[PDB]
Amino acid sequence: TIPHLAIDPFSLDFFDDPYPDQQTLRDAGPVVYLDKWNVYGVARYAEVHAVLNDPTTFCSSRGVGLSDFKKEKPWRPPSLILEADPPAHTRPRAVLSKVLSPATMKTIRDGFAAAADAKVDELLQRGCIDAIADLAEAYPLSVFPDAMGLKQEGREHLLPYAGLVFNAFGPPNELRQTAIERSAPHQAYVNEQCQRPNLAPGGFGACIHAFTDTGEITPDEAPLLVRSLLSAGLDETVNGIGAAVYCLARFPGELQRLRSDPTLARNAFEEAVRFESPVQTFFRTTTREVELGGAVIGEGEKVLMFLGSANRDPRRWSDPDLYDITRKTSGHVGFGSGVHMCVGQLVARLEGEVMLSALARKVAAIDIDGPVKRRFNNTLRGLESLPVKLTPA
Ligand code: HEM
Ligand SMILES: CSc1ccc(C(=O)O)cc1
Ligand SMILES: [Cl-]
């Protein structure tokens, strides 16, 4: 009853253009079996949403990559939040929710927005830029390590460690093995920065440690929780901002609408998260035999959720291949859904909003004027190079 497909969603050919294969995966059935890796897959919005919101059947504590922690050893100690189920997940989730809370956003908004305005004005002096290296990457690196409270020494390990984290969710292909091999220097840097003396008071990392006083986490738990904020948040946000810029260049009508009403900046970024879905795919592991979309899945089976395909399912979205900055985006699964739904979403939205606001107020045109290159990652979708010419307003 379940169709078997030979599509490899972790192949360079798939990364290069996944959308025709995503339709094949959606139209083959609500549940497919991927013979290449011996996993189940769901590519439609309805089943992806259902799996995310059924954590007792589709668990995370056996890993959210291909590897099953009950069968293989994790490449690093399991995350206390991402790779945990309720109730172990609850108190670490609560600490990060408070650390990255609405009230926290008030303390960082002025500095984050000033840095975005200054970056755009700097780039307009140059004219022709790489919107990845010089904008999508440069801006988060100028605000988030400071907000974390990291020291200056060693920040060159931050992007390599993030790329490693997301490649390691993948299958044991060249991308994953190349990343894990000789990764000890990146791991050693990150683990050291998670210790309380190395985090600036008032930063995100020091605030996590401050919660050990409360009984929500123990002091021996706090370093691993800090590690989550050195694992997630960087590459996805970079990829999201780069996709937004790409969309505003490829859809010039939408840049003109954003210029006319800069208060659309926050929804313009949300639509880019849907359109690009920086986190493309995530796994769950079944804890029991379960019926999903009329198909029966055994216990202990890996289930691949295609978040990017779910966000482009024409069963759920009108003109899903169109970038539309006034789209009602509520319900997209680019940040997940349910108990694990991105705890850092307010930080991500703040960075993207203030960058798109700066562009909206200062830029009249964005023209691609050089070869565009893709960045390849087992889990993340995003661009490597995006040469554009910025015309001032
Ligand atoms: C556009 C940017 C981002 C995207 C697309 C994204 C995507 C996601 C998704 C899909 C999940 C759900 C994982 C699951 O259900 O297994 C998640 C969770 C998470 N994200 Fe984000 N994220 C982004 C930004 C951030 C930022 C800025 C931070 C930190 C400041 C962050 C930290 C986390 C953490 C710690 C979790 C685990 C939450 C939990 O398990 O309860 N992410 N993210
Ligand atoms: C959903 S991407 C991601 C989220 C959390 C962590 C972590 O907790 O280290 C790593 C990756
Ligand atoms: Cl590590």
Q: Which domain holds residue 154?
A: 1-393
Tokens of 122: 């700097």
Q: Could you tell me if 168 and 75 are in contact, meaning their C-beta atoms sit under 8 angstroms apart?
A: yes
Cα(120)–Cα(339) distance, integer angstroms:
36
Is the minimum distance from the CB of 96 to ligand 2 under 6 angstroms? Answer: no
Is the minimum distance from the CB of 228 to ligand 2 under 6 angstroms? Answer: yes
Nearest to 100 by CA among 349, 334, 335: 349
Tell me how the structure was determined: X-ray
Probe target for ligand 2 pocket from 83, 191, 228, with the most ligand atoms within 8 Å of CB: 228
Probe target for ligand 1 pocket from 207, 225, 342, with the most ligand atoms within 8 Å of CB: 342
Q: Could you tell me if 30 and 294 are in contact, meaning their C-beta atoms sit under 8 angstroms apart?
A: yes
Residue 78, preceding peptide bond in cis (omega within 30° of 0): no
Tokens of 295: 């198909």
CA of 219 to the centre of ligand 2 (A): 20
Q: Which positions make up the binding site for heme b? A: 89, 93, 284, 340, 342
Tokens of 352: 């993207």
Cα(65)–Cα(300) distance, integer angstroms:
14
CA of 180 to the centre of ligand 3 (A): 11
Is the minimum distance from the CB of 280 to ligand 2 under 6 angstroms? Answer: no
- Atom 11 of ligand 1, residue of closest alpha carbon: 342
Q: Give me the resolution in angstroms, 1 decimal.
A: 1.7
Instruction: Give buried/exposed letters for 292-321 (b at 16+ CB in 10 A, else e).
Output: bbebebeeebbbbbbbbbbbbbeebbeebe
Query: Which residues make Cβ contacts (< 8 Å) with residue 241, sequence separation at least 6?
Result: 135, 136, 139, 140, 269, 272, 351, 352, 355
CA of 341 to the centre of ligand 1 (A): 7
Phi, psi of 376 (to 5 degrees): -100, 130
CA 204 from centroid of its chain's CA atoms: 19
Ligand nearest to the CA of 60: 1
Give the chain's domain count.
1
- Atom 9 of ligand 2, residue of closest alpha carbon: 228
CB neighbour class for 101 (10 Å; exposed up to 12, middle 13-18, buried from 19): middle
CB neighbour class for 257 (10 Å; exposed up to 12, middle 13-18, buried from 19): middle
Element (H, E) at 375: strand 373-375
